[PDB]
Amino acid sequence: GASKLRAVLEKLKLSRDDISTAAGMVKGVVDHLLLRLKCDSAFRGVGLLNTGSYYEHVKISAPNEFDVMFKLEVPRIQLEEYSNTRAYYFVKFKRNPKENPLSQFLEGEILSASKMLSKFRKIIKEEINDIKDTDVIMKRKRGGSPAVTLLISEKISVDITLALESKSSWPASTQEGLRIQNWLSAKVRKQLRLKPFYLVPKHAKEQEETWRLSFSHIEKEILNNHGKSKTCCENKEEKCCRKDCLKLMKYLLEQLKERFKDKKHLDKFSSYHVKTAFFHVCTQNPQDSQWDRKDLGLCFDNCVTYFLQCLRTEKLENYFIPEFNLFSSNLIDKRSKEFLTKQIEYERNNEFPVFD
């Protein structure tokens, strides 16, 4: 039944590529926000994580929902790992010029996120206040990241996440992660780990001024140069279905979350979990011939199958930090993962009614 999957991918491709003023409205707003933040002492070097691509989408099915990252480089920071969480960190400074521009957000040794955010959110509030032309509103909701959600017009939503950028070596918790060696090669892994890493404000539970590692730039680089062969998806004789399988996994989850948004059992699942499981299947199946365009149906099924295995065993290691179990029962409880298991098996056994 790979014929249905192709049609699903065609609709999704058409929706995304259809002419839209959305990206241009959000560019206008983001560009005003950046200039106004660049005028303030603490945010002088703030900039876009992806330049030219204001249109990063979390929900592959929601074209009016945008997700942007404002990065700010911090030199010579000291990370202290928080509570053996492996992913969450206190941000200290080596502070050899003690007058670092973020000195105003200090609480002794420790960089305060809630303070940085409240000022970030206040500068942003002061520019969405001075909006010319089109109308935009700030929907300030809980959670440190995204910092704010902007609503433009009736349909457009922009999540803005603030991120510290570190150009030093990745924390030890990543040392055994990104296990792409038998897929993208050991030399690519080394290249990637020379790239910076990011830290976004975040709490482990739902108290403390912690930051969480973010590697969305590495995920993007992998997806756009994803084959074992350097020529994967350039020709037609080596055209693969890796990106299609990811889009199908994302769209399955988004459709099931929408189908059950009144029951809450699926609220903790996100794109992270499907992207992570996908990349694990990329390591398991490193050959481009295991992702043949013609095998879209079988390839999708391996992804669904592996995702179901993660759910039932309650194990899904973060791709960058192998000791962080995304499916631990402290993050998602057994009944929630068992609920999702049942719905996906119902989809697979009825030829995915969410793809009708």
Ligand X SMILES: O=c1cc(C(F)(F)F)[nH]c2nc(NCc3ccc(-c4ccccc4)cc3)nn12
Q: Which residues are annotated as a binding site for 2',3'-cGAMP?
A: 67, 159, 202, 212
Smallest distance, Å, CB 21 to ligand X? 29
Within residues 331-350, the interface with ligand X by CB under 6 A covers 331
Is residue 214 involved in binding ligand X (CB under 6 A)? Answer: yes
Smallest distance, Å, CB 297 to ligand X? 24
Is residue 275 involved in binding ligand X (CB under 6 A)? Answer: yes
Smallest distance, Å, CB 77 to ligand X? 17
227 touches, from Zn ion, ligand X, none (C-beta below 5 to 8 Å by class): Zn ion
Annotated binding site, which residues? Answer: 51, 53, 65-67, 159, 202, 212-219, 226, 232-233, 240, 250, 271-275
Is residue 219 involved in binding ligand X (CB under 6 A)? Answer: yes
Is residue 257 involved in binding ligand X (CB under 6 A)? Answer: no
Smallest distance, Å, CB 22 to ligand X? 23
Of the pair 36, 189, the CB lying nearest ligand X is at 189
Is residue 227 involved in binding Zn ion (CB under 5 A)? Answer: yes
Is residue 43 involved in binding ligand X (CB under 6 A)? Answer: no
Tell me, letter by letter, the H, E, C secondary structure of the chain: CHHHHHHHHHHHHHHHHCCCCHHHHHHHHHHHHHHHHHCCHHHCCCEECCCCCCCCCCCCCCCCEEEEEEEEECCCEEEEECCCCCCEEEEEECCCCCCCCCHHHEECCEECHHHHHHHHHHHHHHHHHCCCCCCEEEECCCCCCCCEEEEECCCEEEEEEEEEEECCCCCHHHCCCCCCCCCCCHHHHHHHHCCCEEEEECCCCCCCCCEEEECHHHHHHHHHCCCCCCCCCCCCCCCECHHHHHHHHHHHHHHHHHHCCCCCCCCCCCHHHHHHHHHHHHHHCCCHHHHEHHHHHHHHHHHHHHHHHHHHHCCCECCCCCCCECCCCCCCCHHHHHHHHHHHHHHHHCCCHHHC
Residue choice 318, 325, 336, 343 for contact with ligand X (CB under 6 A): 318
276 touches, from ligand X, Zn ion, none (C-beta below 5 to 8 Å by class): ligand X
Query: Which positions touch ligand X (CB under 6 A)?
Result: 87, 212-216, 219, 272, 275-276, 279, 318-321, 324, 326, 331
